[PDB]
Symmetry: D3
Subunit: 170 residues, 6 copies
């Protein structure tokens, strides 16, 4: 019954009697009592009357089933996020080279080595001039698009995405 879905995939459920299509990230945020088990986040208690629409291939009938667990698997690796002055942002890999101004020179610096206060070269969208801006904040971030969600349901483990009956999206 193990499956993988992107965060933005919409599946069809019944909450408080009415049916609708919720994104799997929303379905996760519709549970609580989070627990970091193994290498994933498991949520087992719902805070709204939840049921997932599945299919019974023995009787060939659309059916309701219980959402036992909702699972959120963090990204494998993470990116580095430089919040710079003048509002500009820069997300990149830890090994990607960043153009830095130091000691009157333009040098290529491994993103992992950039520190707050360092000068990044950016290029103004209006004037197309090289601008010297400072790194205000450095954050190791996991892009929501890199998360993998799973759904453990009782008995009937298939899920209804748009019009289709899908088992997983690994």
């Amino acid at each position: 019954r193990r499956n993988c879905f992107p965060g933005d995939t919409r599946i069809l459920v019944q909450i408080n009697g009415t049916p609708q299509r919720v994104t799997l990230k929303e379905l996760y945020e519709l549970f609580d009592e989070e627990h970091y088990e193994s290498m994933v986040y498991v949520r087992k208690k719902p805070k709204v009357d939840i049921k997932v629409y599945s299919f019974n291939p023995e009787e060939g009938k659309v059916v309701l089933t219980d959402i036992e667990e909702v699972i959120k698997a963090p990204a494998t690796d993470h990116l580095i996020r430089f919040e710079l002055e003048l509002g500009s942002s820069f997300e990149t890999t830890v090994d990607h080279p960043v153009l830095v101004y130091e000691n009157g020179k333009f040098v290529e610096k491994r993103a992992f080595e950039v520190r707050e206060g360092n000068i990044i070269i950016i290029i103004d969208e209006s004037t197309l001039e090289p601008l010297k801006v400072a790194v205000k904040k450095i954050e190791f971030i996991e892009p929501p698009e890199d998360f993998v969600f799973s759904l453990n349901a009782k008995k009937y483990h298939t899920v209804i995405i748009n019009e289709n009956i899908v088992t997983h999206q690994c």
Copy 2:
């Protein structure tokens, strides 16, 4: 000078004197004389006066350089696309199980084994009833989001994405 970019990444160029931001898929479709070399598609002749904006870190100056080649690398694996009756579509992996109606039974069939004329079970978005629809067309497709583009430029190999000076997006 080898790099990787998604198809939808916008880089800044000068065409016929004016500068603007074009997607790398557009930049590819702005060349011609295609050639399948090694395992990639190379386009070397431009049909519009093209130059890419890069950066000179010796003088610290934004500069124009020539786009020698634009490269398009096909997806690794491909998906199967079922065009069904009533307008519905279904894209999936060759090994994903598809709910099929055959011999009065609902069976799980490997997508690779589905044939035209087979009956797929779908679920109507309005009525939530199981519908029996027929496979009209079967296509092995490569999603545009799975293509990897590259840019070979002369001397200065960096590229200006929004405000940032990036080397690649591998």
Copy 3:
């Protein structure tokens, strides 16, 4: 009790009282009631009195045991098969370049892009002249040599291949 065997590996069994060596592909085709479960084909009902010869290392005795399931795992990726005129065939990878004649030119075309009616260049075995033949049929095929079989037996999970007692061939 999970194992892997090529299709052509011969193991020793007793069918209808007599013992003999059957290939694992034959052993699979000696069952029925196929089911595509997970990502493999499982056959659980035998159509002939079947037992597999295994070994009891506690008493050190050759023994008979029941064949619960026979499993067939499809190839990972598949090849493209071009059936050409004049009887010639061509099996290759989806990314391998095929010599095509189009618009009076010999071009290298990604096998994935070849279509029925396209002209392939072949070389006659007798005369060694380049011949222009047409693609009559295009098939995505899985070579039997790429399939991986498994055997689930009761209690004693080893198998007798020629003279040897082997556990698997992963």
Copy 4:
């Protein structure tokens, strides 16, 4: 011009004026002056007048070209070969368990740990009795079927296999 071929693949060449189809293992054994360079065996001097048949797609003509190097890449990992008494052989992986008789017990022993003089249990093909045989010889062997060959030719790098014009078999 880098390619990969199995040892048993037949390509078409001209030796001493006459054309014929030789296996790539034979083509390798038709050269000498072996050299272990990088992680492969290179042979550069031919001991017979050799030329390989290739294709000129500019003029669309079958052509002769020079075989600069023939390359033989050893298998990645190797197997263990037990030569046992009574003529029986056993090839397996270093981690596969071998049924051994020691101290009056049948034990599963990692193939890597088996030594000469150890007792292997085999099963006679005629009588189907368990036989105790001794390991006479232990050899770390590389199966010929696991070798990967390459051909470096001048200018025209394609090769004629049966009727087809193929670039590689990676």
Copy 5:
């Protein structure tokens, strides 16, 4: 409860009432009744009163628990060890080139092909002269530093390494 630890990692246990820090290799060698199961060595019977110190996060208390199994996983691949004359040793990979003297020539030979009696070139640490020494012994060895150990404990599966409460070291 599955974990991985290097051989030299020290965990804290109580043997015969007194607590101390033992290396996981020592902890393995403190059990017996070895069994090669799957692809690992399992030891289940202790020859000394053993208990492992774990943590109870419900009561937040350091606790004793039973060591059910201790597991030792062999290295993936192995090295070749040349015992040479004059006491010198040489450990290397099966594919690494070894400088050999044969037929009055210095040749690079694949380590896998070196045989006993072959002449290796070494360089004396005192005089810095090239010395011709003979291969006396050839051994396929698994470096202790390449082994991966595991601990199966009852209920509480965490382990106390120095001052820290760690789950694994995969």
Copy 6:
């Protein structure tokens, strides 16, 4: 001429006329003019008269050659280092669970989510009591043992490690 060596591997060189064995990390720190090129750190200017001892297999003679570049390749992934109060340290993977005290509860927290000021549970080596200590510092660190060094030398690319003539240690 591309090779890989651990940081602690000692190779034999001549500095200012005298020969000795320096670790490759020391050899790197004996150069300067660092440059982050591709995904590695290259040092090309020596600050001490350097030459590396290599071997000439044509004349069979130990020889001196020039060290063109010394290369340092950063670790693939990095660890998280928690500097805690009372002097204790904790290095772990970003996904490893850390025992945290929050809201009067002992919870398992993904190391990536631990913040400064959080309470870690450790276990005193003397008293074996659980101690509540605070995270003072959080550092993303690359262990020196995870770095891979390379040496580009002129003509003769082999290196003398102890008594042996080795090409690489990939």
